[PDB]
Amino acid sequence: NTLVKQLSSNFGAISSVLNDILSRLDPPEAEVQIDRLITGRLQSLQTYVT
Amino acid sequence: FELLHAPATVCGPKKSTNLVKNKCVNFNFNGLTGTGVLTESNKKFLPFQ
Amino acid sequence: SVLYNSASFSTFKCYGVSPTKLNDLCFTNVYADSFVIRGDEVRQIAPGQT
Fold first, then answer.
1. Helix, strand, coil percent content, chain A, rounded in steps of 5
2. Which of A37, A42, B15, B48 is most buried, judged by most C-beta within 10 A?
3. Which chain C residues are Cβ-neighbours of B33 within 8 angstroms?
């Protein structure tokens, strides 16, 4: 349950829905927004596996 | 502008399309995108949600 | 999209959304404000500026 709850966090981005970012922005400005969220989710998964 | 605040009523001229269900299809509801299977719902909503 | 180039405005910049993507999203309670300012003060109207 704790792992699943992590999908509802901004992680410093402007929204927590990837489709929203892909829909309301262009790639050149969506790059960093996707990058930060990817980093956060990867860290959470690493902790769970450990 | 403000996004996802109410039952939106103002946006650009994109033509609607015939409704289909019970198949793995894409969808686009007031800028809400995604894919999945649509089916009839037994839930009930308050008349403002 | 038609307004984006109908009058060829001198300055046209969008924050939080791409100008070419305004033809798909659906909004609520669109506001509009207008004024007249000198040329120098235009660069100081962007949010986050002093």
1. 75, 0, 25
2. A37
3. none
